[PDB]
Amino acid sequence: GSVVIVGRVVLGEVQVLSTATQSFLGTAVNGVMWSVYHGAGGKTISGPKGPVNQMYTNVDQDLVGWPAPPGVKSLTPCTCGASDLYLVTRHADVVPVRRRGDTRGALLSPRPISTLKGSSGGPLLCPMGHVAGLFRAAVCTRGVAKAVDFVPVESLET
Ligand SMILES: CC(C)(C)[C@@H]1NC(=O)O[C@@H]2CCC[C@H]2OC/C=C/C(F)(F)c2nc3ccccc3nc2O[C@@H]2C[C@@H](C(=O)N[C@]3(C(=O)NS(=O)(=O)C4(C)CC4)C[C@H]3C(F)F)N(C2)C1=O
Ligand SMILES: [Zn+2]
């Protein structure tokens, strides 16, 4: 009934999060580990110090947030306005993405949806290594991902 940290992706470190049935990612920004509601629901983040309740819960935007667990360093928000981004997956892959709006980004090369499955909550990074967005959904046709939908980093504030 809680979310557990089961690993990380070393870039800054993205957290690999798991429930009893699902696994996804968590990205710390502004002292808050953000993730997606469709993975974590309203569940707490567990750990040796005891369960911690979510401090942010938005079902409409599919965005949730816990206070960053001790040791989870926050990534730097992107302020350079880059349009060439990089999606970090749970498998440490770094998929180039061309931003085509506030919440959308086109893939330079279509990827099978299976390779992006489980990477919701991962960051989209700019050429400087700063987080410009948070992976939420994929634009899928014939089982192939041609674009992604993400929560803009501007929405990841206190
Ligand atoms: C066809 C498709 C690809 C399955 C689907 N595309 C899709 O919907 O595209 C349209 C067009 C562009 C945006 C989107 O508009 C609808 C908005 C969807 C949403 F995201 F805002 C969302 N809000 C919710 C809020 C509350 C409760 C449930 C919600 N459920 C949602 O959507 C659901 C979930 C989301 C998802 O699967 N995300 C990913 C992922 O990895 N998850 S996961 O870790 O394996 C796992 C399931 C363990 C947690 C990255 C994408 C993929 F790479 F795996 N979905 C379905 C999709 O992406
Ligand atoms: Zn930047």
Q: Name 25's Cβ contacts closer than 8 Å, sequence gap at least 6.
A: 9, 14, 15, 16, 17, 35, 88, 90, 118, 119, 120, 121, 122, 135
84-155: CATH topology = Thrombin, subunit H (2.40.10)
**Side chain identity at 68, as an amino acid letter?**
A
Indicate if 91 belongs to the active site.
Answer: no
Edge-first strand order for the sheet with 63-67 is 44-45, 2-10, 13-18, 23-29, 32-36, 63-67, 56-58
Please report, for the chain, the start and end positions of each structural domain, with discontinuous segments joined by +. Answer: 2-67, 84-155
The method recorded for this entry reads X-ray
Q: What is the resolution of this structure in A?
A: 2.3
The answer to whether residues 11 and 125 touch, using CB atoms and an 8 Å cutoff, is: yes
CA distance 35 to 123: 10
CA distance 65 to 83: 26
Indicate if 155 belongs to the active site.
Answer: no
The answer to whether residues 58 and 37 touch, using CB atoms and an 8 Å cutoff, is: yes
Indicate if 102 belongs to the active site.
Answer: no
Which of 18, 38, 93, 155 is an active site residue? 38
* 104 to 54, 56, 70, 101, 151: CA distances (angstroms): 26, 23, 32, 5, 9
CA of residue 85 to ligand 2 center, whole Å: 9
Q: Closest Cα to atom 31, ligand 1: which residue?
A: 38
Q: Is 15 exposed, middle or buried (0-12, 13-18, 19+ CB in 10 A)?
A: buried
CA distance 17 to 35: 9
Same fold, 2-67 and 84-155: yes
Q: What is the DSSP string of 34-91?
A: EEEHHHHTTPEEP-TT--B--SEEETTTTEEEEEPPTT-PPBPBP-S--SEEEEEPTT
Q: Which of 40, 77, 76, 72 is nearest to 56 (CA)?
A: 40
The answer to whether residues 136 and 120 touch, using CB atoms and an 8 Å cutoff, is: yes
* 152 to 73, 88, 91, 134: CA distances (angstroms): 19, 15, 22, 7
Q: How many beta carbons lie within 10 A of that of residue 74, not counting itself?
A: 17
Give domain 2-67's CATH number out of 2.40.10.120, 2.40.10.340, 3.50.50.60, 2.40.30.10: 2.40.10.120
**Side chain identity at 86, as an amino acid letter?**
Y
